């Protein structure tokens, strides 16, 4: 539930 987590591979 964290909208600011890394949305990319790395």
């Amino acid at each position: 539930v964290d909208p600011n987590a890394n949305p990319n591979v790395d």
Partner: antibody, heavy 127, light 107 residues
Framework: QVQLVESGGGVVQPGRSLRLSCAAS????????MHWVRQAPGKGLEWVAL????????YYTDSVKGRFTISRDNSKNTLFLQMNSVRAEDTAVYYC????????????????????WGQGSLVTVSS | EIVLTQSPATLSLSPGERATLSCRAS??????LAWYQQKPGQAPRLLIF???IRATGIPARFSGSGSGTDFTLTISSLEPEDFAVYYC????????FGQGTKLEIKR
């Protein structure tokens, strides 16, 4: 080489649906998070939604939650915004934007900014 | 939500002059701030991220500083392609933008 080309804008009556498309070229689409950001006529920028590289997580701003759906088709290098139950206040230029997936040789990692943008697609919601 | 307040609303300057733009956050965003440039009819363009890191292909005359709640974008020598609207953006808590500062040509 990075390009983001949007399509699908136009006039839509209140309560109806419209789907925007954002076709990517010149980068590895399938490893980047992707966002939609909008700008109403003569106003500033407003984040709309975000989708992870693999499509597994999705986030929305409150005013569109339950009405808009973000999705992607990596085999076709395309990002989608499905806009249902549209309202006049949704009138805006809609931009897709690539998540600024930054890293360096030092392991330092950064994200959550918008490093490349589509040309914009105007959606006019009006009766 | 974190509100970003930009000042001044409009900055009236001439090519060659130093421009200094401010962005104030309603609470700390640590260093999770970016700056964008936008011209009429065009998409925005990322200039600076993580408060001070210049994006690829951005001229060295642009620089960012600050942390916590107060941030500055400086253009050391303004050039004609820099007359535009500038926005700040944070990614500390969701995604919000300032309301913009217009850098206009003085005459």
């Amino acid at each position: 080489q990075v390009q983001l080309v949007e399509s699908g804008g136009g006039v839509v009556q209140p309560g109806r649906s419209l789907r925007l498309s954002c076709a990517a070229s010149g980068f590895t689409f399938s490893i980047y998070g992707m966002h939609w950001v909008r700008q109403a006529p003569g106003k500033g920028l407003e984040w709309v939604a975000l989708i992870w590289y693999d499509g597994t997580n999705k986030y929305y701003t409150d005013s569109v939650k339950g009405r808009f759906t973000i999705s992607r088709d990596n085999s076709k290098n395309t990002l989608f915004l499905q806009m249902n139950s549209v309202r006049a206040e949704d009138t805006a230029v809609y931009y897709c934007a690539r998540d600024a997936h930054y890293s360096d040789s030092s392991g330092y990692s950064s994200w959550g900014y918008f490093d490349y943008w589509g040309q914009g697609s105007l959606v006019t919601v009006s009766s | 939500e974190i509100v970003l307040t930009q000042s001044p609303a409009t900055l009236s300057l001439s090519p060659g002059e130093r421009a200094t733009l401010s962005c104030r956050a309603s609470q700390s965003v640590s260093s999770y701030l970016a700056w964008y440039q936008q011209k009429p009819g065009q998409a925005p363009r990322l200039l600076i991220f993580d408060a001070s890191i210049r994006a690829t292909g951005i001229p060295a005359r642009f620089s960012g500083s600050g942390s916590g709640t107060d941030f500055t974008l400086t253009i050391s020598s303004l050039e004609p392609e820099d007359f535009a609207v500038y926005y700040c953006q944070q990614r500390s808590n969701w995604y919000t933008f300032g309301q913009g500062t217009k850098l206009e040509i003085k005459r």
